Design an enzyme around this catalytic site. Structure first.
Site, mmCIF file in Angstrom:
data_model
loop_
_atom_site.group_PDB
_atom_site.id
_atom_site.type_symbol
_atom_site.label_atom_id
_atom_site.label_comp_id
_atom_site.label_asym_id
_atom_site.label_seq_id
_atom_site.Cartn_x
_atom_site.Cartn_y
_atom_site.Cartn_z
ATOM 1 N N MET A 130 58.346 64.288 -8.044
ATOM 2 C CA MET A 130 57.161 63.487 -8.394
ATOM 3 C C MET A 130 56.795 62.420 -7.354
ATOM 4 O O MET A 130 56.131 61.431 -7.671
ATOM 5 C CB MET A 130 57.290 62.874 -9.799
ATOM 6 C CG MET A 130 57.275 63.890 -10.935
ATOM 7 S SD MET A 130 55.752 64.853 -11.046
ATOM 8 C CE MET A 130 54.598 63.625 -11.657
ATOM 9 N N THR B 55 55.047 59.007 -7.482
ATOM 10 C CA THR B 55 53.560 59.084 -7.541
ATOM 11 C C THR B 55 52.940 58.028 -6.630
ATOM 12 O O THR B 55 53.294 56.848 -6.700
ATOM 13 C CB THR B 55 53.041 58.918 -8.986
ATOM 14 O OG1 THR B 55 53.621 59.927 -9.823
ATOM 15 C CG2 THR B 55 51.518 59.034 -9.042
ATOM 16 N N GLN B 56 52.020 58.466 -5.777
ATOM 17 C CA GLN B 56 51.358 57.585 -4.819
ATOM 18 C C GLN B 56 49.855 57.863 -4.738
ATOM 19 O O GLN B 56 49.321 58.675 -5.496
ATOM 20 C CB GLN B 56 52.015 57.714 -3.436
ATOM 21 C CG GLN B 56 51.911 59.096 -2.803
ATOM 22 C CD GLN B 56 52.691 59.210 -1.506
ATOM 23 O OE1 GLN B 56 53.922 59.182 -1.505
ATOM 24 N NE2 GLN B 56 51.975 59.349 -0.394
#
Lengths: 140, 233
Positions: free
Chosen positions: B107, B1-2
């Site tokens: 993800m 996740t970013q």
């Protein structure tokens, strides 16, 4: 005594590696190939022994490209030559990924040199039955 | 996740009778700050494909490197790398679509919306979309982000369905693209005046146009507008 030529990494009484010298015999038996360095580039040439009329002309390509500026040609065990080029292609891609610039020829030469030398250090691996002529144009 | 840091806005595209046209501006926004102005967001792969990428610029530069490696890998042990076994727009898209879906499944997505524009070996027009979720679709007109809301309605007035494509010339198609870029510069706060335009035709090949500007702007009516309701002067 004798038997120094049975295992790969074994030094003979006169400090020689016979299994490597035996691999040279596989190269000498192979097809002739050359390389000529000119004023601003290099030229590679290879013989292609036509075994029979059944071989489709201009199809069985022997000369291989590494990256987009390096050309490779080899004599001896053709499958061994392909294995070395595959390693060189991975080695060139690793250099470009980290340093942005395409791999220099002297830099690429050592990468193959260290990899082939590695196959002379163990009895679990066989030396390459190929002598590879390669090169290209870089920064200088 | 970013989270996206340096970003690029809309990428607009449509297909005409002989090929496709794709356009994107040269901006690299840092939030509300318009930081970078020399950012090419249209990546030509070969001479038959142009890849337009919007969103995270650092991820775009990663994809740009993957496309350059795809060209290098295709030419390995391939005597027909510039002929029959050349990279097709469909090959390039399917590869990117695989990467985009694999990253979202792990993800760790590539924060991008990508449109692959090109012409197939048989002469067929190729125009397909892929985003950070791996969602893929094809349409006569395609636009990312802000262009999906503003440029698409304008471009669909030219080509509403599949039968309108052979009736649309290069001149009419490019005019609709340039007009859409002006409208995007009018109402999008993350848009630049300077943009690039690429035409992939089955006859004339690839035409990459750089340093194009939004011209013929209407601003004269602003002088007559004063106040916000009751103010007269």
């Amino acid at each position: 005594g004798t038997g120094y030529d049975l295992s790969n990494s074994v030094f003979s009484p006169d400090g020689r590696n016979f299994q490597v010298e035996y691999a040279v015999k596989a190269v000498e038996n192979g097809t002739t190939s050359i390389g000529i360095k000119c004023n601003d580039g290099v030229v590679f040439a290879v013989e292609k022994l036509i075994t029979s009329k059944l071989l489709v002309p201009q199809k069985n390509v022997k000369i291989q490209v590494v990256d987009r500026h390096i050309g490779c040609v080899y004599s001896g065990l053709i499958p061994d030559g392909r294995h070395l080029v595959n390693r060189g292609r991975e080695e060139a891609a690793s250099f470009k990924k980290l340093y942005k610039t395409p791999i220099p020829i002297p830099a690429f030469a050592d990468r193959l040199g260290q990899y082939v030398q590695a196959h002379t250090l163990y009895n679990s691996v066989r030396p390459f039955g190929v002598s590879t002529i390669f090169g290209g144009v870089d920064k200088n | 996740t970013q989270q996206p840091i340096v970003t690029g806005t809309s990428v607009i595209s449509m297909k005409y009778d002989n090929g496709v046209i794709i356009a994107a501006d040269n901006l690299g926004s840092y939030g509300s700050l318009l930081r970078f102005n020399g950012v090419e967001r249209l990546i030509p792969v070969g001479d038959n494909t142009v890849v337009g990428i919007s969103g995270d610029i650092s991820d775009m530069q990663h994809i740009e490197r993957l496309l350059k490696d795809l060209v290098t890998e295709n030419a390995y042990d391939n005597p027909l790398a510039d002929a029959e076994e050349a990279l097709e727009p469909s090959y390039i898209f399917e590869y990117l679509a695989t990467v985009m879906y694999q990253r979202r499944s792990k993800m760790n997505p590539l924060w991008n919306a990508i449109i692959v524009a090109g012409v197939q070996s048989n002469g067929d027009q190729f125009l397909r979309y892929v985003n950070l979720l791996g969602v893929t679709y094809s349409s006569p007109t395609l636009a990312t982000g802000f262009g999906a809301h503003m440029a698409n309605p304008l471009l669909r007035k030219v080509v509403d369905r599949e039968s309108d494509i052979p009736k649309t010339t290069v001149q009419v198609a490019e005019e609709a693209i340039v007009n859409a870029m002006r409208v995007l510069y009018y109402r999008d706060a993350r848009s630049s005046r300077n943009f690039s335009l690429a035409i992939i035709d089955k006859n004339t090949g690839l035409t990459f146009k750089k340093n194009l500007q939004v011209e013929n702007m209407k601003w004269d009516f602003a002088k007559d507008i004063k106040g916000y309701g009751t103010q007269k002067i």
